């Protein structure tokens, strides 16, 4: 997995690849690593797929209840604090590595959370197996005062570095742009540079090829 | 009615009659006083000699908390001991976590919150003691008086028990006549006099005087009992003033 | 002593044109010893089909657990659970046992009764959801099934064609795995009819 | 403990269970009955860890006997097997699991059908025409695959069982001191005294 | 110390009445009038904002509460009891449904969970019943629009339209005359404002009236775009301005 | 497990 | 009246009636006397019988080699409190290799009795105790009351007609306090003291119970023919 | 302490009655009448809704008749909220039995357990009993069609025809008059409605004030079907028998 | 990591490197290891990033609650709370913390808390992997009652050597100045400190 | 009539223990007042020290809950200090869990929910206090939120509490009718404090010395109380106008 | 296993 976060003047952008693996086998060629904690707080997850999804949904649920209780739009630091306290409690046994980003009344924010419960602040971050490929691109091209269109380009370029050079990462690039004073736009399959080429042959079998012992109608109704 | 049969029940007035009844048990008790001085506090108490068979100097009523706080009380003596036992736990846990000995105001609220807790439920009885306590911390000398309701304030002088009105009147004169302040050694002698004057309201049985003090200069900021020559000097001063 | 490969077995699910197919082998063994050639791994709660590979005691336990949960669901909701919702229930239930998991590879298949959309999904033992347009594979011959499905499969197959494709995918994958085979079952699922076919395969 | 076999025929279920109880280099007993009657028409044979086997069998027996008294009704073999499986399925994720493997042979009086259930210590249940536990299966399953027919009589079933015991006495390393054979049918449970 | 009250404070009287539930209903009767009307394409719930003081900011006190994106609640009776019920209702929608099925509960099942909480205060040790009746309006894909009443006993009934509290008897008679099965949402809002004017005595404007609808999905209120299936909340609280617009054509 |  | 239902209720004058009723159980109890010099402390107890066929209820309990009490009131409550003292005396020995001070013994009984007078459900102890002991600060005599009030005395008496013995000791104070290094003479003064609390009955051989502790004397109880010397 | 305010819900009268059980039964006697009639080929459950309002939603409503599993239903008389607590318990107990034995729960076992829960609230815990009486209509392969009732005491009994709630005295006399053992379901439907029609406190019995359910073997071959009647179906059956 | 705190005439100064490592990979090259537990009580964090953040967050909570009730806590009080967490959970924590604060009575104070959970009050303290290389240098060069400019130089030169020799230390040198004047943040970039 | 002893409904649907708790509120015979400026929120309370032996510095009914939130209590000091300590604990825990300072209105709601529980649970009595919370919230700006023994709470443009509350309320009502705005249109907090004291003097009809008043001020990022000399400076300003 |  390759996930990045990039800050620009009026917001923050997070991107991710779409490959899920079971050992050396690709389980999902187009899985979604970008999770909505709250409408304007989004999360990118690497590590144990279930752990990143479960911890994202739990804090997302508690943040919604907190938002309704306080009659206030949720803050990134709240999601960050609740996540890192939960992850610390389980002493790294919940294998969730997350880039938490969003806009709130306080402004735009970008954090990373490691499974043991450490948090980092930055203008650009990368996590996962392809983080070193991505961080190489970020360290080469990142500058202060990026525009929206520049930050999307930099973020997607950093993911592509992971897709091509890291065996853990591949397929497509998902992006989410969180700009201040605007609705967050989730760009599912923003880039699809790994389309499967036309097969040489159709393997559609002549009907009756498979040998059958028994047939029966199944009753699904009451 | 029946509003006074259960603790933590508001009467139509907005009063907790069970707490007001506990105060009656305090008013019944022997006289105890506190005098705040220049760089510390002085505590004194009336000990009624019921019988010749009481061993003199060997029924101590004033109790120390930590090393720097003195506590004296009027009313149900066992209830007072229970409150000091709690105070000692509170002061130990404060020192354990924060290293520094518990400040007097901090200590006052620890007792205050505990006594107040015994007015929140019908499964407990309010405390049958008014507690006069204080000592010396980093910010200087503090004297406090705590009541069955959980009510406490800082005091220049404090008095409770059967001779409280007599003691209060004598305390009010010291505050007026010494605006710049009273010295520790003076306050010990005055404490003796005020107990002897307050003994007029309890004069059937003759009594035994007990004094303690914390002073930054005289006791080095630690709680000590006044004994031997300094005690007899204070008794003689008090004996001279009644005559 | 690897729980997922003691008993052995495989499940595969595919989508066609207005139809889904789910298929499984019939073997239950104790490592090398074949014990039962009647052990079905596909169950159904109304019109939602669930295949479960892995440790056979957990296959049985989870079937009994989801029957229990879908029965209470139907009594309270006054309607049959839909595939998308059941998928979420499976995921919740597996992650509840995060640090003591069921050693299973479940596969949900069925057609949403409201939208008429074909739906398939797979899960790891910890409850992570693997949603797919094309196909889901599970079991001791998952590598073999991935290879067969990825080559044989094409979109929008008719029910009768989809039957041939899934059947050949399972049979040829099972014959390259020692712990899988010993018979196979294929469910063809249309909007309001379901055909169940037992395949003739080599019995070694 | 070691050898427990089961053969379901037309009208009955036959359970064969080895008589040897070995500990170290000593055969302590050569007449051990590795079975409990759960109900008049349901018999359970058991094999596995010492102590656990009898403790588990008697615990199940007590629960089924309690159900029988409470409802004044005999639980179906299918119902008993489902209950036993769930007890083992709980056991395996316990602090100390029951290391017991069981065969449940029963006659369902409502269906008028014999039923044989094979359940391992993990809680793995299967209905079979013939079943075995431990190393016995490695010989008896291939033998029964050949010689077994579904419409056999109880006498044919006993001859088919003799064929299994003869093969085990020939090729098994350990002396298991023969088997106790019991038949479960419409008339209940009876023991073959001469085998 | 400790809660020694482990016994019921609500018991049967010789007549078969549950005193504390009857008395709770009396507290609801004293409460300010709230109502609900179900249309073909939506539901409206409305109530008066009885201001404790003109110095108080009645915007800060919300009598109409969002429970889920597609479910809203209003009450008559004791506000504090309502506030903690909304807190528990919002949480139970998550813990006992959304965290299991990954979707929000249908109206009837959330109502059932709220009813359960109120029934327990009727039977559990050392507690009085809740002194509120709730009106819960909601939508869900398989049941459509629905409106429910929940009483201190824990009993709940579905309604085409109803009112609770002060002037409920008169308000119910008014709704019976006006309600038909062909009402559009705008027609139901119009009737809701007519019905509520009868029970309100003082000022009648968008600052003294609290009104919310369960209608069409509001993509603009969702807060994000990119997921086609997520189309936004059906619960919308009408603004002070939006109410005043409809009071001119009254 | 499935990793990302 | 309305304020004696339980120990958690104060009366309008600030009284705890359940504690006062517990105090009443002591007055009904048989007389016991305590007195000490500088060297020795003595308990003298008048034991009570159900009838002539019954034994005489044992009044004196040993707590450690250097400490023990006499009881007046509910004997089972004396057993509970004496058992608690035995444990506290024993804790002091095992943990600190230190004989428990008679003063601390009093403070511990006080705090144990108090908890029963402030909590719902419980009841006050229905017994009074006279604790004698010899520790690092010489001979001691304590009077325990189930209100929680513990008092250190030269001499005292509790139980029925205890006022007779208490008046005698108040007169004899100057004499018996200076009976140093003479056990038999201090007991005689204790036996003469309890004799002032007798009506119609006199001290017999299976009636009188004496205990003594001192400088070179472990806490030892004398009953039967051992007390015949002092009649 | 708190002793002062304890009703003591689980004590005997000098006559040896349980006060709270007796007063709970008095509560149920004011609830809408519910009737169960057991025929040779099915069971009828009929129940009268408590004084209906014209603006009550009738079609998407459930007050009286609840489903426990595919083979068992209950008619409720008393506090609906109390009944729903017990119903959810009964629904779970049924699924626990199915999970354990891979067989649908026999009707009596489910009834006994629900009755044992009610018994508990009369003997310990110091809580008020459940103000609920149930009519259990169910089928199993042992006893076939079965009618039971349970009440706040936790006592249960079996019936051929029974009523609970209001006017049971009057209702039970009319059932005892016109019931016979060789009765069919369609006949039992008519008896159930005729009984409510006479015992009702209302002016005339109408479709909007009734809940109705049958448990027949009227499905296809040796299987049981539960039919919770729709408003329009109650309107039709009420015209067919000639009550309206 | 390389962290130190030095007392001087006007108060105390905290210094640290900016590098966080997993193995030989630098996870964060601009880490802030100087963290506020109170207005004028700060700490330097070394060891586990997760453990030190969890401890610092709890101490900040305890001192905020202390301030609500008893007013401004002493630097000694803050060190005592750090010790209590570190000592009582010694089996599950890898955290070497230096606590530094400015009272108006006590002036600048430094407490070091090694792995054990022991407390040591010192005129100056050094900790982290890079500290080993500057024991010799710091001992020879440290003087009591230095000026602000002298102390900033002492810390800059010290951490400069620690960074040079230790692979685990690097990036910028962050410093935090605690005096009566207030709180001042300082940063020094490689191009400056490398060529000292 | 045991329905008047614990928090259960009377036949007419009332909780008498809640009503009697409200009457305990005025037991101290002290009047409090809160108003909002542009940048600040000012709270003033009467300070009565009848006993000459009392240390007047220790006599206070205003509490610093957090750095940003201040709280004034109308009711007996034991219940006041009970409520203060809990609020302090709740505000500290909120900051630790959710990573930002507890807002004034959220603390008020939390304390109000606690109050509500005492009205529903029998073993707990209501506190005989009315809690007035003041801050300058980083989202909502100058904020006044007040809690009572019923568990009721609401925001206020301005508010008054105590025996002569109604006289202070109508005095403020008449001012906001005239000014036509929701706050005191004033730059400095010094002049908002002067307004608060001036309008309390007019309503109560009494003059104040420096020792008769107690003042709390909430600005952005801190709440603080004024010393006797800070108030005296403020009283001199009013007098010279 | 981030360190400092
Ligand atoms: Cl809350
Ligand atoms: Mg094979
Ligand atoms: Mg083979
Ligand atoms: Mg370096
Ligand atoms: Mg209460």
mmCIF file with all atom_site columns, C-alpha atoms and ligand atoms in Angstrom, chain I residues 19 162-170, ligand 4:
data_model
loop_
_atom_site.group_PDB
_atom_site.id
_atom_site.type_symbol
_atom_site.label_atom_id
_atom_site.label_alt_id
_atom_site.label_comp_id
_atom_site.label_asym_id
_atom_site.label_entity_id
_atom_site.label_seq_id
_atom_site.pdbx_PDB_ins_code
_atom_site.Cartn_x
_atom_site.Cartn_y
_atom_site.Cartn_z
_atom_site.occupancy
_atom_site.B_iso_or_equiv
_atom_site.pdbx_formal_charge
_atom_site.auth_seq_id
_atom_site.auth_comp_id
_atom_site.auth_asym_id
_atom_site.auth_atom_id
_atom_site.pdbx_PDB_model_num
ATOM   1  C  CA  . UNK I 1 19  ? 14.727 13.009 13.676 1.00 0.00 ? 19  UNK I CA  1
ATOM   2  C  CA  . UNK I 1 162 ? 25.677 14.425 18.943 1.00 0.00 ? 162 UNK I CA  1
ATOM   3  C  CA  . UNK I 1 163 ? 24.012 14.800 15.457 1.00 0.00 ? 163 UNK I CA  1
ATOM   4  C  CA  . UNK I 1 164 ? 27.412 14.451 13.629 1.00 0.00 ? 164 UNK I CA  1
ATOM   5  C  CA  . UNK I 1 165 ? 28.368 11.099 15.294 1.00 0.00 ? 165 UNK I CA  1
ATOM   6  C  CA  . UNK I 1 166 ? 24.887 9.529  15.932 1.00 0.00 ? 166 UNK I CA  1
ATOM   7  C  CA  . UNK I 1 167 ? 22.992 8.170  12.863 1.00 0.00 ? 167 UNK I CA  1
ATOM   8  C  CA  . UNK I 1 168 ? 19.761 8.179  14.966 1.00 0.00 ? 168 UNK I CA  1
ATOM   9  C  CA  . UNK I 1 169 ? 20.042 12.018 15.489 1.00 0.00 ? 169 UNK I CA  1
ATOM   10 C  CA  . UNK I 1 170 ? 19.781 14.687 12.724 1.00 0.00 ? 170 UNK I CA  1
HETATM 11 MG MG1 . LIG L 2 .   ? 23.247 12.205 11.929 1.00 0.00 ? 4   LIG L MG1 1
#
